[PDB]
Amino acid sequence: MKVTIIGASGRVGSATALLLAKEPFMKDLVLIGREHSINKLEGLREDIYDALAGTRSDANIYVESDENLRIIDESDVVIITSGVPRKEGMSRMDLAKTNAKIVGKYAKKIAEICDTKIFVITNPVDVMTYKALVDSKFERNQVFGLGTHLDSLRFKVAIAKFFGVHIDEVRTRIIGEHGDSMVPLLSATSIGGIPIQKFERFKELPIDEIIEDVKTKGEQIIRFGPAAAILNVVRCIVNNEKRLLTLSAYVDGEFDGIRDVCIGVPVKIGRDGIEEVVSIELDKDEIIAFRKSAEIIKKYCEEVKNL
């Protein structure tokens, strides 16, 4: 497999690089950064080679600037983590427009070289995925974003802890915006396969407290972080696993009254990327909240669309 990471010089990009390099299916790993980052990337490559020393890995690591993307040709997946993180003093719209220009430029440049899958990590992820889809002109199954995948895993841990059951027995998910308008799907939450609604303890679940925790600490490491979540999706693709993850994907009516937007939703993932957006009936409160979330995201998409 060949993977390119644009934004490898950053925190999440460098962590992801280290994890991917250790994978048996990894053949060619391309690390892209701006010209002023080459020295740092060369340092990262040496660190990776040291970590791989002793093993029989035959993976090649490349370091290149973003001036000429010829090197990304034939990549199975291109991960974009370039972008300015949560600014201490700025609005989400300024963040959206600022990163829209970064992700959009890379999406357009990638498409000039080859057809491939784009995995967007830069925030606001749902909006950046949409912008990447628009500027690349790729098919809807080829562009997606981390979305609420890690948020849903965090929620899983919280529920398992509350019921006192093994983590494996809990399957849940959060859809919508990877932000304050996320929607926990209690109608699609099972414990040992049993609907969570069928437990008397469900009545005492601190849903509000738990969600508050996911909204503010959702991108933090779980005592497993963003890097591990990204590897999870990459493995699902190269191994054609067919899992029903929750990622930022393009929707066009799968959920009545929701179209022309990218937003966290259940999808079946495989070697062909988003092989399908799984549409199911939601409960009254969930659909209302989901529409609300989609409306918030649609506004940002409309504002960065032409940038």
Add this chain to the structure above:
Amino acid sequence: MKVTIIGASGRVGSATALLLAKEPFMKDLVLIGREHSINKLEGLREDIYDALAGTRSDANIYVESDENLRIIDESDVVIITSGVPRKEGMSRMDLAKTNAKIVGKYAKKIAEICDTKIFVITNPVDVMTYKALVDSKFERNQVFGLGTHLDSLRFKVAIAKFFGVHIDEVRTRIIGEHGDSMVPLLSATSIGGIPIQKFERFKELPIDEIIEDVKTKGEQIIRFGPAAAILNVVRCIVNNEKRLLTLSAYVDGEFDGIRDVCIGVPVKIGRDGIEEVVSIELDKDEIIAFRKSAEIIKKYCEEVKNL
């Protein structure tokens, strides 16, 4: 951990012995058989020691006849696999009474030595678990049987195959008798956490064909067999995992209109054995079928109770 297997000279007993010996938590493994089986058991112990050669395992393997069970003292769990298998030409009642005398004698002899947990594998498992509970006079959380645990795993594989999703995304179970009166719990079957009823494909699920397969091939190896299923439960106990498996356990009203019988049911398993029988509302057809199944089992229990 210390485990005793009574019936280790048999097919499932010997396979289980081999698997358990390789576990890191295994300290003392006791193999019990009738006097005429000692040579075969000594041969099995040599085979196990050969398999363990090269590793740094510090497990001790003991071979003893069933004349003096002093050796089982302090066992964390005693697995009983002794019994006559499905006779080519005989009724289930004859099988029940015949094995009732075997399992019951061992349950009584074990209780004379120490208090411990008894894991019953001999068929009819639901009836043999009940007989072991009655003759040992142990608490209801200390005696249980494999039940429909492996049947439920087989059902899981069939459903995952039909929907074309990763095995991990499917959680289901079958309750009732480990026999022809088993009851698949579609109301407690989720795909990616989503109720199976919410999929359009659910309408075309060959439930009848699949169940027929589980009823006749349920004890066969899955391309994972009985031995692996037993290790699964043992690991759940020693590691206090808190999984919601489906085992043969004593029920006393957890499911309205069902008591004084051992039958496959959802239970939370931990270091203390059956820490609780999970009672939940079943759909109309499931409860009717479950009561039917319990009535069939109750008849056998009443007939072997005093043996």
